[PDB]
Write an enzyme that holds these catalytic residues in place. Structure first.
Site, PDB file in Angstrom:
ATOM      1  N   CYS A 241       0.849  -1.123  -0.080  1.00  0.00           N
ATOM      2  CA  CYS A 241      -0.098   0.271   0.015  1.00  0.00           C
ATOM      3  C   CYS A 241       0.869   1.433  -0.059  1.00  0.00           C
ATOM      4  CB  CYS A 241      -0.894  -0.055   1.169  1.00  0.00           C
ATOM      5  SG  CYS A 241      -0.207   0.278   2.809  1.00  0.00           S
TER       6      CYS A 241
ATOM      7  N   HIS B 289      11.555  -7.238   3.551  1.00  0.00           N
ATOM      8  CA  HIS B 289      10.201  -6.716   3.126  1.00  0.00           C
ATOM      9  C   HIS B 289       9.286  -6.257   4.314  1.00  0.00           C
ATOM     10  CE1 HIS B 289      11.532  -7.472  -1.028  1.00  0.00           C
ATOM     11  NE2 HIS B 289      11.707  -6.416  -0.909  1.00  0.00           N
TER      12      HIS B 289
ATOM     13  N   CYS C 135      20.063  -3.776  24.654  1.00  0.00           N
ATOM     14  CA  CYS C 135      19.709  -3.742  26.161  1.00  0.00           C
ATOM     15  C   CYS C 135      19.628  -2.325  26.599  1.00  0.00           C
ATOM     16  CB  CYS C 135      20.520  -4.551  27.141  1.00  0.00           C
ATOM     17  SG  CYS C 135      19.501  -4.758  28.656  1.00  0.00           S
TER      18      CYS C 135
ATOM     19  N   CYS D 119      25.056   3.580  35.680  1.00  0.00           N
ATOM     20  CA  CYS D 119      26.088   4.487  35.854  1.00  0.00           C
ATOM     21  C   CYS D 119      27.580   4.092  36.200  1.00  0.00           C
ATOM     22  CB  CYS D 119      25.751   5.665  36.715  1.00  0.00           C
ATOM     23  SG  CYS D 119      26.926   7.173  36.643  1.00  0.00           S
TER      24      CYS D 119
ATOM     25  N   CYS E  13      27.203   7.219  42.162  1.00  0.00           N
ATOM     26  CA  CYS E  13      25.895   7.214  41.497  1.00  0.00           C
ATOM     27  C   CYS E  13      25.341   6.029  41.591  1.00  0.00           C
ATOM     28  CB  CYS E  13      26.147   7.944  40.507  1.00  0.00           C
ATOM     29  SG  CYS E  13      24.270   8.423  39.663  1.00  0.00           S
TER      30      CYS E  13
HETATM   31 ZN    ZN Z   1      25.331   8.655  37.353  1.00  0.00          ZN
HETATM   32 ZN    ZN Z   2       0.010  -1.835   3.486  1.00  0.00          ZN
HETATM   33 ZN    ZN Z   3      10.849  -9.805   0.340  1.00  0.00          ZN
END
Ligand code: ZN
Ligand code: ZN
Ligand code: ZN
Ligand code: CL
Ligand code: ZN
Ligand code: ZN
Ligand code: ZN
Ligand code: ZN
Ligand code: ZN
Length: 384
Positions: free
Chosen positions: A181, A197, A350, A355, A360
């Site tokens: 589309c 695709h 991830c 820190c 910290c």
């Molecule tokens: Zn920090």
């Molecule tokens: Zn579509």
């Molecule tokens: Zn394909």
């Protein structure tokens, strides 16, 4: 002029139309005939959707041409800048594709007591059994392997209430156009072809239903019946067969019976032409009168219409856009700490960040920029 309409059946029933008859008028005729609202119907001709305002002459429809009618309302209301990484098929109460909630447990005791060595970064880490390691905090548990599970995120779910993960489906954050589309939609199904695709969930539904009606599902000996990439790409068949559940209960039931229906036709049998009923009927070798009675209407074997005498009625029985296929290819730095303000480097997919400063040591989410929590963990543990 007469055209054949394929609506949840392998056989197309004849419908009489004129050159000035619009697609909306054709939909209205099939709407009252089947008892389904017209604003829910979609007309497909040679893999392409026909618009309501277009007439028979505009569509270049001729005698004995076959058209498909599929019940799926087109919805524009969707989220483009969604934060969710995963999608699941909720088999109740949603009965559709919904943003998934990723959770972890110990593969031995099935408790949320396993402390992971490292957070997941890819699909393989959460899909392949016993891929990720850790240590269980429950007393005297030998558990060292992680077991990941997905749930529906649209409503509350119990720890047991799991939903099947749809790894081909993804949030269109890359703004990739659909192969069929050309519209920018989210979420999108990504085929496992070399070109990767992208297809929207609306187009994928139209693709699967029309191919169920055309009986063009590709058979693989070590997989079963499935569909490849709409472009006809090699080695692109959907391996995870649970992806066909997204079509809804009615259409997935048709897909499940496809194997049994193919065995009947291979022997020399015939299928029920009536919509909704696709029973594998095995009549006599030279019998014209066939009835749907293994535990209900009489039909002719040749024309597949209601049983009659004498001669059968005189009126008896795709390529993707190159630029659209090229545009539909899915694949073809530093952020400061929300508390320390020191830039932290991202390692892998991830989203769980920590820190490196000794004072910290804040655990935070890469995307949200907030302290690490169960919401960010379930919604977007890793980037995809
Ligand atoms: Zn920090
Ligand atoms: Zn579509
Ligand atoms: Zn394909
Ligand atoms: Cl997903
Ligand atoms: Zn749900
Ligand atoms: Zn355990
Ligand atoms: Zn029947
Ligand atoms: Zn006949
Ligand atoms: Zn987050």
């Amino acid at each position: 002029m007469i055209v054949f309409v394929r609506f949840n059946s392998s056989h197309g029933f004849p419908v009489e139309v004129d050159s000035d008859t619009s697609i909306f008028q054709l939909k209205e005729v099939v709407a009252k005939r089947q008892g389904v609202p017209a604003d829910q119907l979609r007309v497909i001709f040679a893999g392409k959707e026909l618009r309501n305002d277009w007439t028979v002459q505009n569509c270049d429809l001729d005698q004995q041409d076959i058209v498909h009618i599929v019940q799926r309302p087109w919805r524009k209301g969707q989220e483009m800048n969604a934060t969710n990484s995963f999608y699941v098929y909720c088999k109740g109460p949603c009965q559709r594709v919904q943003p998934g909630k990723l959770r972890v447990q110990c593969s031995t005791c099935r408790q949320a007591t396993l402390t992971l060595t490292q957070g997941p970064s890819c699909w393989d880490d959460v899909l392949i059994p016993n891929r990720m390691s850790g240590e269980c905090q429950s007393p005297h548990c030998p558990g060292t392997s992680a077991e990941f599970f997905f749930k529906c995120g649209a409503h509350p779910t119990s720890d047991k209430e799991t939903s099947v993960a749809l790894h081909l489906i993804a949030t269109n954050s890359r703004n990739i156009t659909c192969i069929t589309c050309t519209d920018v939609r989210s979420p999108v199904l990504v085929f496992q072809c070399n070109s990767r695709h992208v297809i929207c969930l609306d187009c994928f539904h139209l693709y699967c239903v029309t191919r169920l009606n055309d009986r063009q599902f590709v058979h693989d000996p070590q997989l079963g019946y499935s569909l490849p990439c709409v472009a006809g790409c090699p080695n692109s068949l959907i391996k995870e067969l649970h992806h066909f559940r997204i079509l809804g209960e009615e259409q997935y039931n048709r897909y499940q019976q496809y194997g049994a229906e193919e065995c009947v036709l291979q022997m020399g049998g015939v299928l029920c032409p009536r919509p909704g009923c696709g029973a594998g009927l095995l009549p006599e070798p030279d019998q014209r009168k066939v009835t749907c009675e293994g535990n209900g209407f009489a039909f002719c074997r040749e024309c597949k219409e209601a049983y009659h005498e004498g001669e059968c009625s005189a009126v008896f029985e795709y390529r993707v856009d190159e630029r659209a296929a090229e545009q539909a290819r899915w694949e073809a730095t530093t952020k400061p700490c929300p508390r320390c303000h020191v830039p932290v480097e991202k390692n892998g997919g991830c989203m769980h960040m920590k820190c490196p400063q000794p004072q910290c040591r804040l655990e935070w989410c890469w995307n949200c920029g907030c302290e690490w929590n169960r919401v960010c963990m379930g919604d977007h543990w890793f980037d995809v």
